Design a protein around this ligand. Structure first.
Ligand SMILES: *[C@@H]1O[C@H](CO)[C@@H](O[C@@H]2O[C@H](CO)[C@@H](O[C@@H]3O[C@H](CO)[C@@H](O)[C@H](O)[C@@H]3O)[C@H](O)[C@H]2NC(C)=O)[C@H](O)[C@H]1NC(C)=O
Ligand SMILES: *[C@@H]1O[C@H](CO[C@H]2O[C@H](C)[C@H](O)[C@H](O)[C@H]2O)[C@@H](O[C@@H]2O[C@H](CO)[C@@H](O)[C@H](O)[C@H]2NC(C)=O)[C@H](O)[C@H]1NC(C)=O
Ligand SMILES: *[C@@H]1O[C@H](CO)[C@@H](O[C@@H]2O[C@H](CO)[C@@H](O)[C@H](O)[C@H]2NC(C)=O)[C@H](O)[C@H]1NC(C)=O
Ligand SMILES: *[C@@H]1O[C@H](CO)[C@@H](O[C@@H]2O[C@H](CO)[C@@H](O)[C@H](O)[C@H]2NC(C)=O)[C@H](O)[C@H]1NC(C)=O
Ligand SMILES: *[C@@H]1O[C@H](CO[C@H]2O[C@H](C)[C@H](O)[C@H](O)[C@H]2O)[C@@H](O)[C@H](O)[C@H]1NC(C)=O
Ligand SMILES: *[C@@H]1O[C@H](CO)[C@@H](O)[C@H](O)[C@H]1NC(C)=O
Ligand SMILES: OC[C@H]1O[C@@H](O)[C@H](O)[C@@H](O)[C@@H]1O
Ligand SMILES: OC[C@H]1O[C@H](O)[C@H](O)[C@@H](O)[C@@H]1O
Ligand SMILES: OC[C@H]1O[C@H](O)[C@H](O)[C@@H](O)[C@@H]1O
Length: 850
């Protein structure tokens, strides 16, 4: 047929709900053409398939409103035949539209609200929204490409994509750039060890699409229901959600970093972590007493390994229950944590969401009080839904209930009164259930058995979690499931603020869009494998683009047994995770830095030492994330979008604009090949911290670098200045040391950098102005600071070393504030000028040479 002449790559599936025969396909009013070898749909929509018609388009002060009408039913039940379209032109960068049922309030995700670069026009029949980039006329969105479906439990909205390059749609084990070859991406939070093609712990319905020439846009669908996102190679995308409404934001960039910042303007800028949170964290399942746990710190200390935060897993609890500690191995738990604090370290422990429900009445306050106050998710007969997790039978708190929030704050404060822990590791908050749904199964209804089930592991919404039709304060679990973790992270953030009075530190397994405003994330139960080491790079980068910059993987891997070589390379790379924790499973061989051979220990110690030297810089990068929606770890394409060679690179990463990390990610290698964008890149090993080229002069090219077992390649971009600080086994110690600058000159002698400094943990620092901020500038053989703000926290900072890279000629003299310096060295082979000074970050200085 004429209408069935649709190019293969542009066929949209008219049988996404079930296996179909040719006769049934045709009776739907669809085209049946088998592919010649999910894949390309054999049953697909002709361009005439019934959609909605636009009627009564009107122009308001905020934008546009219209009615959308479907005349012919779809093959799903409960089509909503009359919809309302609202288009809001919110800023020059942000376009917002919604499609709703004007006759019924439908579930919506709870969220605080925050010439243009876009234009918008509409197709009448079939209905579509078309968004152009005004500067070049590129079509960014065109929803005319397939029918709009809007049924009670099935929404589908499709669009063309501007290129084959698209990233986002966490959480999945994938390259940073997603495959457009008939790929079904499922968002349904699920406790499963990361494996390819699976819905994992978190769900972020946001994508960033690259455009030829290096501009980009982003799209956020504000919808928390179970969904599939289907990418096809035309290229095009289909959102398929199981409930809610279509609430769509388009972010115009044009730069990828701006797209990310614009997205974070809606969902929230990243929270500012405490400085100590950027130190090394060490944990395992199996530190089964305070004595053993104390030995970890002792063993790290004796072998000169920095450690800011000691953790415990389930070991601490009384019979694996929250807000208890056993009176055998952990009898003296309070004293252990007090002692940690006396030495300048912090303490973290695991908290699960589910609460043991099986104890005698009156014997377990978290449950007894939860029951009294009605804090738990309830079932059909109004009683707590009971599942099974680590303690046995458990009820599940409803973190959408304000009373549950108050209860959680209370349980956290009461436990903190016994043991003064410094944050919360919130696990199992998908929510995870070791049985299907509940001890009593689940009822048979349309929420438990919906007409479209996304491609979830196990083929049901109840698999490894609770019943979809269970009740929460705001809605059913069906609607709220993908928010469970997020809502717990918000509750825990608030609880920690109230209990401790300083910045919270929450690390969560499950996440949703906006998570980064409250908490960080670790990537869960990764294997100790070379595969998963390599896969951690794109995953950490992905979460940075999603505004969760406090992210990392379990260093050396969680599951199975690490090898020495793997743990060296994983420690080297993982020292560049913004959140750095080595964590290990119960039955695995030990993998603490001190448990390896001497050469391995040296390499691991070096990795940790370099991280601690860089902490002032890392902290400043977090400040930029927090105040301007920047990324901390970023892919090369975020920083060099106009170099199309960067677009598929995800085994290198940047810290901010200027530090390029090129890890070895394979066994047996003593070299690595990395992409170097146009520029001069100085080898960071030429900066004295306490055939290798000193500078890579790149045109935009791949470069093979020596990378023996003791080495990770780290390069500093010309034009940038990096603040550093002296060593310590903790940040309590390190923050008191002298600082240094590493100054990477351009060929013309230019560089710029910055330092942000506050007390490291107080609330409302920016609001109160309790911070110091300094800019550094190199120009014409001088280095100066520029004092943006100087306060008490910052006025003691001693600058004792200035290292200048790319100094072509040996200076005859070096001056600090007009006075010849006590000592400097120049190396003619590396072009490094190293200068001892006695200066203050917060007082104006001028260092010069000639
Ligand atoms: C809603 O959740 C409640 C729990 O909060 C469920 O209560 C459970 O109901 C089952 C029977 O439907 C009870 O099983 C019975 O146990 C007794 C011994 O204790 C035994 O003699 C019976 O033969 C039967 O096995 C179960 O004890 C009870 N759970 C608790 C903790 O009391 C209720 O069934 C749930 N409703 C729905 C519709 O799922
Ligand atoms: C598109 O809009 C027209 C006109 O709407 C007008 O009347 C409605 C009831 C409101 O008061 C609105 O503000 C007015 O602009 C709709 O056509 C009208 O529908 C009424 C109810 O069915 C009829 O009684 C009326 O005769 C008719 N008016 C005209 C001029 O045709 C039309 O239904 C609407 N289309 C859709 C799909 O909603
Ligand atoms: C948006 O997508 C639609 C559908 O792919 C495009 O509309 C088609 O345009 C061709 C000519 O290019 C016509 O022959 C068809 O009749 C149109 N189809 C439909 C269903 O209307 C449209 O061109 C796209 N718009 C933009 C601006 O790219
Ligand atoms: C801390 O280090 C000590 C010393 O290396 C470890 O103690 C040894 O443990 C092994 C068991 O694996 C014994 O064979 C040795 O005899 C022990 N030596 C001493 C001197 O006690 C200890 O296991 C380490 N603890 C932790 C928690 O890592
Ligand atoms: C992780 O290791 C433990 C213990 O392994 C023991 O035997 C092997 C062969 C080595 O020699 C170790 O040094 C020794 O301690 C195993 O019991 C466990 O199965 C293993 N895990 C996996 C996934 O293989
Ligand atoms: C660099 O400084 C010297 C004075 O110390 C001056 O002669 C020269 O013009 C300066 N260069 C520029 C570009 O300002
Ligand atoms: O995707 C291809 C599949 O489509 C289904 O709807 C058909 O029933 C199958 O025969 C076919 O293999
Ligand atoms: O179009 C019917 C079917 O065709 C084929 C595709 O692999 C499948 O995804 C689709 O459902
Ligand atoms: O608490 C026991 C285990 O629970 C989950 O599997 C966590 O992902 C893991 O890190 C932890 O060790």
């Amino acid at each position: 047929p004429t209408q069935c002449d649709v190019p293969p790559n542009s066929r949209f599936d008219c049988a996404p709900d079930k296996a179909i025969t040719q006769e049934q396909c045709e009776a739907r009013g669809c085209c049946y053409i088998p592919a010649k070898q999910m894949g390309q749909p054999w049953c697909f929509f002709p361009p005439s398939y019934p959609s909605y018609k636009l009627e009564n388009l009107s122009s308001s002060e905020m934008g546009y409103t219209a009615t959308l009408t479907r005349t012919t039913p779809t093959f799903f039940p409960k089509d909503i035949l009359t919809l309302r379209l609202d288009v809001m032109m919110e800023t020059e960068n942000r376009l917002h539209f919604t499609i709703k049922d004007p006759a019924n309030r439908r579930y919506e995700v709870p969220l605080e609200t925050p010439s243009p670069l876009y234009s918008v026009e509409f197709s009448e029949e079939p209905f579509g929204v078309i968004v152009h980039r005004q500067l070049d006329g590129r079509v960014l969105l065109n929803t005319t490409v397939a029918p709009l479906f809007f049924a009670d439990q099935f929404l589908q909205l499709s669009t063309s994509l501007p290129s084959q390059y698209i990233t986002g749609l966490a959480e999945h084990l994938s390259p940073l750039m997603l495959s457009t070859s008939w790929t079904r991406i499922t968002l349904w939070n699920r406790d499963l060890a990361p494996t390819p093609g699976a819905n994992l712990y978190g769900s972020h319905p946001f994508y960033l699409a690259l455009e030829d020439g290096g501009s980009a846009h982003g799209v956020f669908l504000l919808n928390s229901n179970a969904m599939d996102v289907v990418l096809q190679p035309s290229p095009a995308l289909s959102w398929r959600s199981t409930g809610g409404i279509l609430d769509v934001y388009i972010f115009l960039g044009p730069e990828p970093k701006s797209v990310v910042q614009q997205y974070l303007d809606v969902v929230g800028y990243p929270f500012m972590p405490p400085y100590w949170g950027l130190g090394f964290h060490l944990c395992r399942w199996g530190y089964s007493s305070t004595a053993i746990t104390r030995q970890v710190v002792e063993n790290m200390t004796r072998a000169h390994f920095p450690l800011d935060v000691q953790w415990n897993d389930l070991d601490y609890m009384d019979s694996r229950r929250d807000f208890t500690f056993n009176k055998d191995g952990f009898r003296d738990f309070p004293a252990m944590v007090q002692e940690l604090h006396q030495g300048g370290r912090r303490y973290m422990m695991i908290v699960d969401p589910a609460i043991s429900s099986s104890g005698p009445a009156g014997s377990y306050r978290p449950y007894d009080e939860g029951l009294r106050r009605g804090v738990f998710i309830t079932n059909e007969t109004g009683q707590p839904l009971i599942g099974k997790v680590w303690p046995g039978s458990t009820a599940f708190p409803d973190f959408t209930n304000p009373t549950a929030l108050a209860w959680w704050e209370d349980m956290v404060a009461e436990f903190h009164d016994q043991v003064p822990f410094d944050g919360m590791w919130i696990d199992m908050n998908e929510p995870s259930n070791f049985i299907r749904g509940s001890e009593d199964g689940c009822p048979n209804n349309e929420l438990e058995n919906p007409p479209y089930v996304p491609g979830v592991v196990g083929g049901t919404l109840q698999a490894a979690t609770i019943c979809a039709s269970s009740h929460q304060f705001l809605s059913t679990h069906y609607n709220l499931h993908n928010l469970y973790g997020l809502t717990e992270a918000i509750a825990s953030h608030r609880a920690l603020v109230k209990a401790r009075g300083t910045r919270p530190f929450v690390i969560s397994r499950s996440t949703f869009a906006g998570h980064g405003r409250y908490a960080g994330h670790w990537t869960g139960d990764v294997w100790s494998s070379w595969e998963q080491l390599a896969s951690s790079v794109p995953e950490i980068l992905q979460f940075n683009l999603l505004g969760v910059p406090l992210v990392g993987a379990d260093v050396c891997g969680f599951l199975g047994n690490t090898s020495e070589e793997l743990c060296v390379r994983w420690t080297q790379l993982g020292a560049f995770y913004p959140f750095m924790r080595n964590h290990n499973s119960l039955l695995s061989l030990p993998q603490e830095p001190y448990s390896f051979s001497e050469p391995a220990q040296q390499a691991m110690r070096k990795a940790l030492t370099l991280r601690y030297a860089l902490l002032p810089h890392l902290y400043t990068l977090f400040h930029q994330a927090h105040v301007a929606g920047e990324t901390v770890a970023r892919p090369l394409f975020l920083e060099f979008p106009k170099d199309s060679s960067t677009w598929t690179v995800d085994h290198q990463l940047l810290w901010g604009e200027a530090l390029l990390i090129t890890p070895v990610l394979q066994a047996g290698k003593a070299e690595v090949t990395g992409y170097f964008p146009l520029g001069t890149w100085y080898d960071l090993q030429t900066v004295p911290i306490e055939p290798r080229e000193p500078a890579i002069h790149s045109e935009g090219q791949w470069v093979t670098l020596p990378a023996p077992l003791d080495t990770i390649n780290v390069h500093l971009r010309a034009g940038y200045i990096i603040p550093l600080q002296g060593p310590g086994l903790t940040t309590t110690e390190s923050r008191q040391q002298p600082m240094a600058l590493a100054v990477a000159l351009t060929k013309g002698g230019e560089a710029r950098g910055e330092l942000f400094w506050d007390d490291g943990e107080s609330l409302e620092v920016l609001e109160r102005g309790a911070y110091t901020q300094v800019i550094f500038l190199a120009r014409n053989n001088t280095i100066v600071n520029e004092l943006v703000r100087v306060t008490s926290e910052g006025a003691g900072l001693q600058l004792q070393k200035v290292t200048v890279l790319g100094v072509a000629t040996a200076p005859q003299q070096v001056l600090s504030n007009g006075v010849p310096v006590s000592n400097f060295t120049y190396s003619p082979d590396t072009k490094v000028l190293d200068i001892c000074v006695s200066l203050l970050m917060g007082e104006q200085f001028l260092v010069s040479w000639c």
